[PDB]
Amino acid sequence: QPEPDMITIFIGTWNMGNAPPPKKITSWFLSKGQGKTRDDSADYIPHDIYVIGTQEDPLSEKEWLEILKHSLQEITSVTFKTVAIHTLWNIRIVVLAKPEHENRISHICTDNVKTGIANTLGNKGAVGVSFMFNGTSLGFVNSHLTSGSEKKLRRNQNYMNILRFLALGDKKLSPFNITHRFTHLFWFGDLNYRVDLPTWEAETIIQKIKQQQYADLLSHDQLLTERREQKVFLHFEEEEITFAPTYRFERLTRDKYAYTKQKATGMKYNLPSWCDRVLWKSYPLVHVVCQSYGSTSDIMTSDHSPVFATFEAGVTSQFVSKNGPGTVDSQGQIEFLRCYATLKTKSQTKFYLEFHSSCLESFVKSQEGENEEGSEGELVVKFGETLPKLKPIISDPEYLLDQHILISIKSSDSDESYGEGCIALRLEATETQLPIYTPLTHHGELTGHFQGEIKLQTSQ
């Protein structure tokens, strides 16, 4: 039975509005309703992995697992295995997998982050799951961010706290936050970004939604605008939105948006908005294709509609050679040539690099680079041809070309990372000097760039 080189992943996000679900929620897992929907011819074909995020979830873990497993069994006739379940307050993530994947999945991690202080600490935050699927690391974040049209900056702060403090994936990757630890990272939830139009325009917005004319609404979506101004979710992707706003509905129909201020809303308007989202970030030159992104039309117990997204995701096999794992393979090498980091920092410490990759036995520290002044004020750290030659565990190009090198640039004075990035070894040529580039981030904000050349030797 061969190991897969592609899997499909279902991501669901639903704010349940503290109400039990209806008896049938199969439309969700089938990607049926509005938006980019799944072809009917696929309905019996199970996804490899189903990741369900809920918010305002009133059920016990047991209650929801029974509904989910029985739902998938009805669709697919497959009894899914529970990989992980983790709940913070009423925020929950469930990971289910086809039974054939049970002995491909390992290194399962769960964590949560509570956002805010005092007043603002007590119901918002995130849960997450990570695991290995053969040679591929997968991370999943379900976040319920701060509500309210006038709190987009709070949401952005919530995002940064979650990606700093959620402790998933390989702890040996110590300079790296979750936005660098995974081949594929999916971040979804009730992100709570709103359509930023005047309150007086509520009926106009509703009109536009009834005509399926979303362009003038999406141009005011706070998540799209904040992302475009690099305020949040830097280097993440989102499929185009082609479904109606998923909030705020009257319960038990989808015919009415309930937007007017009420005691129950703290006298806040809830103009129709795309609160409920799925974004991802994959390592450079790894296959990831969104095959659906939409909302259900027939699940009406909540003031939110469920959102689905499905993905094709490239995976790799757990590679064994006569040499690595357990030793280096002298027919392999990675050389970084004429490299320099451009940093936004005003500080004047020396810097060194760390190279982290599961193709190395352990991480590699460089010598200190040479600081020069950039023409427009910048710090440029020059490494020249001084960088250590990296010794991969496996030289076979079918393995090595599928790998990635994480780079941290660290202060000699503090050993703190000033920037993190990632370089793909999926090169156009071996034994050939080729340009490389990554942006550098720290706490998910841009701090600089790393560029230079690479020369990769494989056994072929």
Binding flags for ligand WKA, 22-61, as an x/- string (CB under 6 A)? ----------------------------------------
Least Å distance between CB 46 and ligand WKA? 13
Q: How many residues bind ligand WKA (CB under 6 A)?
A: 8
Q: Which stretch binds ligand WKA (CB under 6 A): 62-70, 99-107, 292-300, 388-396?
A: 99-107
Nearer to ligand WKA, 4 or 419 (CB): 4
Site of tokens 């010598």: 367
Least Å distance between CB 50 and ligand WKA? 11
Nearer to ligand WKA, 65 or 288 (CB): 65
Least Å distance between CB 133 and ligand WKA? 10
Nearer to ligand WKA, 20 or 135 (CB): 135
Nearer to ligand WKA, 130 or 458 (CB): 130
Largest CA distance in the chain: 70
Taking CA 36 as the corner, what is the angle to CA 32 and CA 40, rounded to the nearest 5 degrees?
45
Q: Which stretch binds ligand WKA (CB under 6 A): 98-106, 170-178, 221-229, 314-322?
A: 98-106
> 161 φ, ψ to 5°?
-60, -45
Nearer to ligand WKA, 1 or 362 (CB): 1
Nearer to ligand WKA, 109 or 405 (CB): 109
Least Å distance between CB 313 and ligand WKA? 17
How does 220-233 read in b/e, with b if 16+ C-beta sit within 10 Å? bbbbbbbbeeebbb
Nearer to ligand WKA, 70 or 107 (CB): 107
Alpha helices (H) along 126-254: 152-165, 178-181, 202-210, 215-218, 222-228
**Under 8 Å between Cβ of 139 and 168:** yes
Q: Which stretch binds ligand WKA (CB under 6 A): 77-85, 118-126, 296-304, 428-436?
A: 77-85
CA–CA separation, 12 and 308 (whole Å): 5
Q: Tell whether residue 422 is a contact of ligand WKA (CB under 6 A).
A: no
Least Å distance between CB 105 and ligand WKA? 4
Of the candidates 149, 231, 138, 226, the residue with the CA atom closest to the CA atom of residue 185:
138
Q: Which stretch binds ligand WKA (CB under 6 A): 102-110, 240-248, 325-333, 436-444?
A: 102-110
Virtual torsion, Cα 26, 242, 307, 28, nearest 10 deg: 0
Q: Tell whether residue 318 is a contact of ligand WKA (CB under 6 A).
A: no
- Provide the 8-state DSSP code for 263: G
For 31-94, the DSSP string reads T-SEEE---GGGTTS--SEEEEEEES--S-HHHHHHHHHHHHHHHHS---EEEEEEEETTEEEE
**Under 8 Å between Cβ of 264 and 176:** no
> Which residues in the 125-184 window bind ligand WKA by CB under 6 A?
none
- Provide the 8-state DSSP code for 302: S
Nearest residue to ligand WKA, by Cβ distance, number only: 81
Nearer to ligand WKA, 73 or 432 (CB): 73
Q: Tell whether residue 105 is a contact of ligand WKA (CB under 6 A).
A: yes
CA–CA separation, 292 and 40 (whole Å): 12
> In angstroms, what is the C-alpha Rg of the chain?
23
Classify residue 51 as exposed, middle or buried by CB count within 10 Å of its CB (0-12, 13-18, 19+). buried
Nearer to ligand WKA, 16 or 84 (CB): 84
> Which residues in the 78-97 window bind ligand WKA by CB under 6 A?
81-83, 97
Nearer to ligand WKA, 102 or 203 (CB): 102
Q: Tell whether residue 102 is a contact of ligand WKA (CB under 6 A).
A: yes
Least Å distance between CB 177 and ligand WKA? 25
Q: Which stretch binds ligand WKA (CB under 6 A): 100-108, 141-149, 180-188, 226-234?
A: 100-108
Taking CA atoms, 308 is separated from 52, 110, 209, 223, 267, in Å, by 9, 22, 19, 18, 31
CA–CA separation, 381 and 372 (whole Å): 6
Nearer to ligand WKA, 103 or 211 (CB): 103
Nearer to ligand WKA, 97 or 299 (CB): 97
CA–CA separation, 134 and 105 (whole Å): 7
Least Å distance between CB 315 and ligand WKA? 15
Strands 49-55 and 6-15, sheet pairing: parallel
Of the candidates 226, 162, 171, the residue with the CA atom closest to the CA atom of residue 194:
226
Q: Which residues bind ligand WKA (CB under 6 A)?
A: 81-83, 97, 101-102, 105, 108
